[PDB]
Design a protein around this ligand. Structure first.
Ligand SMILES: [Ca+2]
Ligand SMILES: [Ca+2]
Length: 314
DNA sequence: GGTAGACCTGGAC
DNA sequence: GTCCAGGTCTAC
């Protein structure tokens, strides 16, 4: 059918594949795992969301990642469009090589890895990432998802409508920094997060030199980037690490939340050796990130994603 | 320098 | 009805 969300069966000629075995990527273990909060499984095994300013639907078979895009006459995705998809999933980073290494250095990762293959990091937009995670504060993945889409519906560009879903592009800096945005976000249920969204939008635009400041962080060192990000209102150590890891190409960045504390304790009998505190605190959190980084290497943030994800299923 | 308490809320046990 | 989720900010 010409309407509604597509499916591999439904509209055969509208899809194009990207070679990709399930061992290198698993949508159901990545898309709803707290990295991006903008993907939904409309029909079973089919995920629809905004990717590179367009709406896509993705579904995978054992060796292929099937993609379809909604923009002109309907048609399969072009090689360039598909390239953007390959880019978003950083398919050039070989998950098999990373899992192997992590496995040989961490007997525990080995055990968990066997059952949770295909977990990788998405290369996200700094702006979308920065604001989505500002909303992470004392919040669960479902509530976060709700806030973010409401935020996008209210200040994001209208893209296309499939069934009763009107997809929106992520709001721009200028839009989020607009008069009365906070008040609006509060009526949307973001709570005290409304304030930080507005504050950070204005901060970047009226104090840091704008969008470029954020984007230039991809060329900066992990340390510089993380240091810079913490300046923004509502952006602490954890949020900045998420941004570094998920959007600034800092693969060693390890977000330390309660989840990783439970993992560190239960699975590694970890204890803080520096800080004198027995639980989560700025100094012990820093210490843990260094513990994982020392344990897994340069792509510790990635290894972190595999366990965080596995810890969510449970 | 290293804590405790304030800040919002929808789904839980 | 108290509890919990990918926290952060700041006053003592
Ligand atoms: Ca929490
Ligand atoms: Ca800050």
């Amino acid at each position: 059918s010409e309407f509604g969300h597509r499916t591999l069966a439904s509209t055969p000629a509208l899809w194009a594949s990207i070679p990709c075995p399930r061992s290198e990527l698993r949508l159901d273990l990545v898309l709803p795992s707290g990295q991006s909060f903008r993907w939904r499984e409309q029909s079973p095994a089919h995920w629809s969301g905004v990717l590179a300013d367009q709406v896509w639907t993705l579904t995978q078979t054992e060796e292929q990642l099937h993609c379809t895009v909604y923009r002109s006459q309907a048609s399969r995705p072009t090689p360039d469009e598909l390239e953007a998809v390959r880019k978003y999933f950083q398919l050039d980073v070989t998950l098999a090589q990373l899992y192997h290494h992590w496995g040989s250095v961490d007997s525990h990762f080995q055990e968990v890895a066997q059952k949770f293959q295909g977990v990788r990091l998405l290369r996200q937009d700094p702006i979308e990432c920065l604001f989505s995670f500002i909303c992470s504060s004392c919040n669960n993945i479902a509530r976060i998802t709700g806030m973010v889409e409401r935020l996008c519906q209210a200040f994001g560009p209208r893209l296309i409508q499939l069934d009763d879903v009107t997809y929106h592009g992520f709001p721009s800096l200028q839009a989020l920094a607009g008069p009365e945005v906070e008040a609006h976000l509060r009526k949307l249920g973001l709570g005290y997060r409304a304030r930080y969204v507005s504050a950070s939008a204005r901060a970047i635009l009226e104090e840091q030199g704008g969008l470029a400041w954020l984007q230039q962080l991809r060329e900066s060192s992990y340390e510089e980037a993380h240091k810079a990000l913490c300046i923004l209102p509502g952006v602490g150590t954890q949020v900045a690490d998420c941004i570094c890891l998920m959007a600034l190409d800092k693969p060693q960045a390890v977000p330390v939340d309660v989840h990783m504390w439970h993992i560190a304790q239960r699975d590694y009998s970890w204890h803080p050796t520096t800080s004198q505190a027995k639980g989560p605190s700025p100094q012990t959190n820093k210490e843990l990130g260094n513990f994982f980084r020392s344990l897994w290497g340069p792509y510790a943030g990635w290894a972190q994603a595999v366990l965080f994800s596995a810890d969510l299923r449970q």
